Amino acid sequence: NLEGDALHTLRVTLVDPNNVLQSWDPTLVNPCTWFHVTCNNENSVIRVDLGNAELSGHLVPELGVLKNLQYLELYSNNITGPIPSNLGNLTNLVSLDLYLNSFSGPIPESLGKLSKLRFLRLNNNSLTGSIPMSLTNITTLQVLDLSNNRLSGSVPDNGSFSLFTPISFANNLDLCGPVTSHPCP
Amino acid sequence: SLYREIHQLISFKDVLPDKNLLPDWSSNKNPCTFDGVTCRDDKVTSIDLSSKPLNVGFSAVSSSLLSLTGLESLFLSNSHINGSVSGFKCSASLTSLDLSRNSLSGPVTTLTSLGSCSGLKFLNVSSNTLDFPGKVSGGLKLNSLEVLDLSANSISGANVVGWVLSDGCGELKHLAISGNKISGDVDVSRCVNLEFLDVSSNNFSTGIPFLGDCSALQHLDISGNKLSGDFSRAISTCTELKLLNISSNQFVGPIPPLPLKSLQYLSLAENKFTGEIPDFLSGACDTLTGLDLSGNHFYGAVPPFFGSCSLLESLALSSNNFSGELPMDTLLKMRGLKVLDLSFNEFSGELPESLTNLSASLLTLDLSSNNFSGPILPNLCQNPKNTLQELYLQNNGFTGKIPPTLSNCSELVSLHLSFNYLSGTIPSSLGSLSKLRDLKLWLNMLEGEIPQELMYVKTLETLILDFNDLTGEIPSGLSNCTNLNWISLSNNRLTGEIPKWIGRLENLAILKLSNNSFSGNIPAELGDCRSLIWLDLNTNLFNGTIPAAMFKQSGKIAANFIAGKRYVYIKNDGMKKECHGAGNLLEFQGIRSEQLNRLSTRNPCNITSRVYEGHTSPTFDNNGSMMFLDMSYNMLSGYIPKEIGSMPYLFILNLGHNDISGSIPDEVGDLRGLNILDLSSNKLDGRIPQAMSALTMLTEIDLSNNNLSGPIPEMGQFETFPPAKFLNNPGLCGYPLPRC
Ligand SMILES: *[C@@H]1O[C@H](CO)[C@@H](O[C@@H]2O[C@H](CO)[C@@H](O[C@@H]3O[C@H](CO)[C@@H](O[C@H]4O[C@H](CO)[C@@H](O)[C@H](O)[C@@H]4O)[C@H](O[C@H]4O[C@H](CO)[C@@H](O)[C@H](O)[C@@H]4O)[C@@H]3O)[C@H](O)[C@H]2NC(C)=O)[C@H](O)[C@H]1NC(C)=O
Ligand SMILES: *[C@@H]1O[C@H](CO)[C@@H](O[C@@H]2O[C@H](CO)[C@@H](O[C@@H]3O[C@H](CO)[C@@H](O)[C@H](O[C@H]4O[C@H](CO)[C@@H](O)[C@H](O)[C@@H]4O)[C@@H]3O)[C@H](O)[C@H]2NC(C)=O)[C@H](O)[C@H]1NC(C)=O
Ligand SMILES: CC(C)[C@H](C)[C@@H](O)[C@H](O)[C@@H](C)[C@H]1CC[C@H]2[C@@H]3COC(=O)[C@H]4C[C@H](O)[C@H](O)C[C@]4(C)[C@H]3CC[C@]12C
Ligand SMILES: *[C@@H]1O[C@H](CO)[C@@H](O[C@@H]2O[C@H](CO)[C@@H](O)[C@H](O)[C@H]2NC(C)=O)[C@H](O)[C@H]1NC(C)=O
Ligand SMILES: *[C@@H]1O[C@H](CO)[C@@H](O)[C@H](O)[C@H]1NC(C)=O
Ligand SMILES: *[C@@H]1O[C@H](CO)[C@@H](O)[C@H](O)[C@H]1NC(C)=O
Ligand SMILES: *[C@@H]1O[C@H](CO)[C@@H](O)[C@H](O)[C@H]1NC(C)=O
Ligand SMILES: *[C@@H]1O[C@H](CO)[C@@H](O)[C@H](O)[C@H]1NC(C)=O
Numbered sequence: 001n002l003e004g005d006a007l008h009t010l011r012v013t014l015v016d017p018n019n020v021l022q023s024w025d026p027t028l029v030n031p032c033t034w035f036h037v038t039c040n041n042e043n044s045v046i047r048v049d050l051g052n053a054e055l056s057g058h059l060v061p062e063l064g065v066l067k068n069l070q071y072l073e074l075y076s077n078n079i080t081g082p083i084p085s086n087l088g089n090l091t092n093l094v095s096l097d098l099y100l101n102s103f104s105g106p107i108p109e110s111l112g113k114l115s116k117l118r119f120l121r122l123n124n125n126s127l128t129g130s131i132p133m134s135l136t137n138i139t140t141l142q143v144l145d146l147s148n149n150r151l152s153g154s155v156p157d158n159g160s161f162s163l164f165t166p167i168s169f170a171n172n173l174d175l176c177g178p179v180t181s182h183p184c185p
Numbered sequence: 186s187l188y189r190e191i192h193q194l195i196s197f198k199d200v201l202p203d204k205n206l207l208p209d210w211s212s213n214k215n216p217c218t219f220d221g222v223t224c225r226d227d228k229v230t231s232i233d234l235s236s237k238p239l240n241v242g243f244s245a246v247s248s249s250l251l252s253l254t255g256l257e258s259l260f261l262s263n264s265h266i267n268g269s270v271s272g273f274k275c276s277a278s279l280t281s282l283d284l285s286r287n288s289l290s291g292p293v294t295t296l297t298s299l300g301s302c303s304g305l306k307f308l309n310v311s312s313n314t315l316d317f318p319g320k321v322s323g324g325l326k327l328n329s330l331e332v333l334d335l336s337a338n339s340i341s342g343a344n345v346v347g348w349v350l351s352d353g354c355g356e357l358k359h360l361a362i363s364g365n366k367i368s369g370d371v372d373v374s375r376c377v378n379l380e381f382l383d384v385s386s387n388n389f390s391t392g393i394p395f396l397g398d399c400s401a402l403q404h405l406d407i408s409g410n411k412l413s414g415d416f417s418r419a420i421s422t423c424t425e426l427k428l429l430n431i432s433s434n435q436f437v438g439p440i441p442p443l444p445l446k447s448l449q450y451l452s453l454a455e456n457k458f459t460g461e462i463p464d465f466l467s468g469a470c471d472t473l474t475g476l477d478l479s480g481n482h483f484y485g486a487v488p489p490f491f492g493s494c495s496l497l498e499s500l501a502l503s504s505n506n507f508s509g510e511l512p513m514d515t516l517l518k519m520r521g522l523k524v525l526d527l528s529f530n531e532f533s534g535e536l537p538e539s540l541t542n543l544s545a546s547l548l549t550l551d552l553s554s555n556n557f558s559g560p561i562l563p564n565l566c567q568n569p570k571n572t573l574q575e576l577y578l579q580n581n582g583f584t585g586k587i588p589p590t591l592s593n594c595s596e597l598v599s600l601h602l603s604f605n606y607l608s609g610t611i612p613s614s615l616g617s618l619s620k621l622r623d624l625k626l627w628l629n630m631l632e633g634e635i636p637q638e639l640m641y642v643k644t645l646e647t648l649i650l651d652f653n654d655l656t657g658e659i660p661s662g663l664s665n666c667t668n669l670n671w672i673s674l675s676n677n678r679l680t681g682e683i684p685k686w687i688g689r690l691e692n693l694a695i696l697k698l699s700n701n702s703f704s705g706n707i708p709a710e711l712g713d714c715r716s717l718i719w720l721d722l723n724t725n726l727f728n729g730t731i732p733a734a735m736f737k738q739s740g741k742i743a744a745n746f747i748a749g750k751r752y753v754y755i756k757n758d759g760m761k762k763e764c765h766g767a768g769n770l771l772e773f774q775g776i777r778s779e780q781l782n783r784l785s786t787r788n789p790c791n792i793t794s795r796v797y798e799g800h801t802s803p804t805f806d807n808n809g810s811m812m813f814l815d816m817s818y819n820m821l822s823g824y825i826p827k828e829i830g831s832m833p834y835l836f837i838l839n840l841g842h843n844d845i846s847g848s849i850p851d852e853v854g855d856l857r858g859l860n861i862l863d864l865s866s867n868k869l870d871g872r873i874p875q876a877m878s879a880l881t882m883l884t885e886i887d888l889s890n891n892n893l894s895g896p897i898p899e900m901g902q903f904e905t906f907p908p909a910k911f912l913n914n915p916g917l918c919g920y921p922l923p924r925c
Contacts, residue, residue, distance in 0.1 A: 041794070
């Protein structure tokens with residue numbers, strides 16, 4: 001139960017007052033029978049929705065070991081710490097919503113390695129640094145909300161980013177480009 | 186003495202936040218006349234404050250009470266005392282101290298300061314919040330303790346035992362460290378007098394404790410650990426040994442040699458042990474009381490030489506690969522046998538007639554989960570004064586009828602006949618059992634109506650009739666059972682309306698009517714049941730409307746008596762339309778999952794997903810609400826009142842495939858615990874209330890086939906859900922559906 005061990009490490013690192021992770025047993029054959037965790041017909045985890053579980057702490061890199069993982073919804077929590085640089089090891093992730101959190105650190109480079117990525121919503125977080133140019137190589141990008149963050153630098157108008165409007169990039173620290181309403185020097 | 190005695194007692198009485206605490210304590214009274222105080226010759230030798238919520242600190246105790254000259258013993262158990270041990274004045278007259286079940290906190294090293302008591306022999310600190318931060322150095326420096334109990338604390342570390350015994354174990358007759366996290370190696374070899382050791386429930390990944398000569402040791406509990414290696418050679422030096430619990434460990438291989446001379450209790454249970462029961466074990470037959478081999482790879486048959494043991498009280502072979510016939514000849518040679526658990530084995534064949542004798546001896550007979558075949562023995566309980574308590578026959582190939590000779594067992598508190606091929610009707614004579622608690626007959630071919638005479642059982646708690654051919658309506662007499670906490674009747678042919686007298690049961694936790702012909706209106710009297718967290722009504726003929734007062738009891742709900750029972754929840758996947766409702770909750774005690782295929786004939790559900798297991802665990806002890814509601818696939822009509830949103834603890838709500846017409850209440854948005862919601866196939870109209878965006882717990886929803894109109898709420902989880910669930914809603918728009 002590699003997936004189960006990984007998710008269990010995640011549980012250990014997480015702070016869970018409501019004990020929503022209580023149902024997770026490392027001794028089990030797999031994680032697939034756990035609450036909020038969904039597996040495919042191949043008995044591998046395609047989904048984890050922990051959203052608004054009122055959790056604290058930070059995440060783990062072992063999440064990147066889920067190959068068939070599709071949906072990850074962590075949204076509406078106090079969760080802190082950086083976004084794992086090895087998250088790019090997730091090929092099949094179609095949705096990532098971290099929004100409404102204490103998450104920090106720069107936006108990981110390896111995220112450019114997600115080909116099937118559709119939803120990315122980071123809005124209302126503490127993230128800083130530039131917005132990776134590798135994300136333009138993701139052609140499947142549909143909905144992105146970065147609004148109300150500390151992100152800085154120039155915003156690429158190429159690739160999939162051409163699909164997006166300033167309200168998504170709004171209320172940031174300093175952002176420049178055709179996409180923003182503030183010009184680059 | 187007496188003056189400062191009473192003055193110290195009162196000076197302690199002054200520190201209590203509750204001004205009225207000690208009723209008889211006052212100045213101008215003989216201290217020896219006080220409650221919880223035992224005085225000898227006008228000198229205080231004892232004080233017992235146990236189970237009295239003092240809500241005071243230890244610092245107040247050490248100064249006032251422990252300074253008493255001539256005081257031998259102080260029992261503070263469950264006195265709600267907080268704080269930590271500090272340096273203080275202690276009389277040498279002190280003998281026994283009980284701090285157990287209290288709030289004492291801080292590092293364990295503080296206990297080193299108890300050496301101020303010169304005559305201190307017996308110390309119980311068990312069940313406190315004490316821990317051990319960081320490294321272990323030096324020692325406890327108490328060698329005078331004949332008894333030490335550290336059990337149920339927060340201590341996490343390695344070789345803490347060495348820190349305890351640093352000053353030597355020479356005088357120590359008793360040690361219990363349990364309920365902690367401790368690793369490393371255990372050396373008791375310097376303690377020649379130690380008669381008792383409980384290290385259980387800990388972190389040891391390493392070798393077994395070093396017992397040295399192990400001359401005087403009568404008790405060894407290593408259980409609840411990761412331990413592996415050879416324990417035989419370690420305990421081979423122990424001549425006199427009684428209780429050995431090695432259970433729940435990583436031990437492997439065949440059963441090795443043991444010190445069987447004085448052995449009373451032996452548990453090898455819950456391990457990787459292989460092979461079968463060795464012969465040499467018979468050497469313990471002059472002694473052995475009870476035995477647990479459960480949870481191993483053991484197979485074969487029971488050695489008949491165990492007939493030499495008349496002292497065996499309990500025999501547990503459960504959870505193994507065992508097969509073969511019943512050694513009734515050997516079993517009858519055991520006079521003191523009481524509980525026999527054969528459950529979860531491959532045992533086969535019909536039932537030997539001689540078994541009819543055991544009704545006058547055995548307390549518990551568990552044959553459950555086996556390859557057994559044949560009829561149920563009608564001659565059973567022919568012998569006078571039948572002593573049988575619990576009978577579990579479930580999961581077998583047993584055929585024939587159910588003989589109403591079982592009424593002749595009057596001591597039977599539990600009957601599980603379930604998961605079998607048994608035919609025939611239900612004998613009314615079963616009503617003659619006043620002591621019966623758990624009656625589970627489910628999954629059989631049973632026919633005929635329900636006995637009215639069951640009204641004569643007031644002690645009835647769990648009744649499982651599920652998955653049978655039974656017909657007829659429900660006897661009103663069942664109302665006379667006020668102690669029923671579980672009612673599950675599913676996949677049956679039962680008809681008729683639903684009783685209105687259900688409100689009479691304050692103890693009822695669970696009601697499952699699923700897959701039946703019942704009709705009529707859902708009674709509002711359900712709102713009078715304060716124990717009820719679970720309702721599955723899905724496939725029935727019920728007409729009428731849905732009352733809003735049914736939820737009035739939510740928030741006062743007490744599920745306390747419901748806990749402790751094994752359950753299975755089988756989730757209905759919406760792929761196949763022939764499998765109805767959210768899911769099926771059934772009582773799984775004493776049954777294998779692998780045999781669930783026996784349901785293949787009775788239910789259309791497969792493709793390999795998905796099963797949920799466990800034990801009943803309500804989310805609240807008191808003042809909660811309904812955790813489960815499935816009315817799906819019925820004739821119910823009208824509009825849903827605002828009260829539908831009064832149950833925050835509700836995990837799953839399925840109203841699907843009904844005639845319900847009206848607007849979805851904004852009160853729906855008040856449910857924070859709802860994981861799965863099916864409103865599908867109804868007449869409901871209007872707009873989805875924006876308040877529903879307040880639901881963050883939904884992993885599944887189906888809104889399809891309604892009259893609903895307007896934009897889909899963008900916020901909340903609606904964006905996560907597929908348009909597949911939103912189909913057949915003409916006026917409905919907004920993501921995931923197309924933009925307006
Ligand atoms: C409410 O409960 C009722 C009763 O519990 C339930 O109705 C039963 O539903 C099951 C599942 O669909 C039915 O099971 C079927 O029974 C068929 C016989 O009627 C059987 O066909 C052949 O089987 C027998 C015995 O093998 C054979 O001698 C005959 O020649 C029959 O033609 C079906 O077999 C199918 O399934 C098996 C394994 O599942 C497979 O190997 C076969 O190839 C075939 O695909 C099947 O077992 C049962 O008959 C129903 N009984 C009645 C009285 O209707 C409802 O479905 C429940 N409702 C809800 C909503 O849950
Ligand atoms: C150190 O302190 C702890 C905390 O008290 C203590 O553990 C407890 O010991 C008591 C025994 O004194 C246990 O109480 C028993 O529990 C069993 C259930 O397993 C009951 O059946 C027992 O009932 C009998 O005794 C009663 C009187 O005590 C009778 O009224 C009754 O009819 C029965 O005859 C008995 O209550 C208790 O379970 C444990 N555990 C706890 C409280 O968590 C430990 O023993 C102390 N150490 C030493 C060396 O004494
Ligand atoms: C209190 C008892 C009466 C009850 C049986 C309880 O012990 C039981 O564990 C309940 C709480 C469990 C049994 C089945 C569980 C559900 C299992 O089925 C559902 O598909 C899963 C899907 C997903 O895992 C959700 O996170 C939870 C969710 C929807 C679970 C929500 C909680 C349960 C409903
Ligand atoms: C033998 O050791 C086990 C291991 O802790 C003791 O635990 C019992 O059985 C299960 C373990 O799977 C526990 O969950 C129960 O709480 C325990 N039972 C009881 C009645 O307390 C067990 O108690 C030990 N056996 C004896 C006779 O003490
Ligand atoms: C995190 O947010 C919650 C409510 O969303 C709030 O109650 C809590 O205090 C916050 N965490 C901290 C550490 O303040
Ligand atoms: C997002 O952040 C802005 C300010 O940074 C705040 O005004 C807004 O309320 C936040 N969004 C939510 C949903 O709380
Ligand atoms: C002891 O109890 C008192 C009662 O209010 C409290 O003030 C104090 O913090 C407690 N000490 C500990 C260590 O909890
Ligand atoms: C339920 O339906 C029957 C007719 O099918 C009717 O007589 C009965 O009154 C209905 N119940 C209510 C409350 O309307």
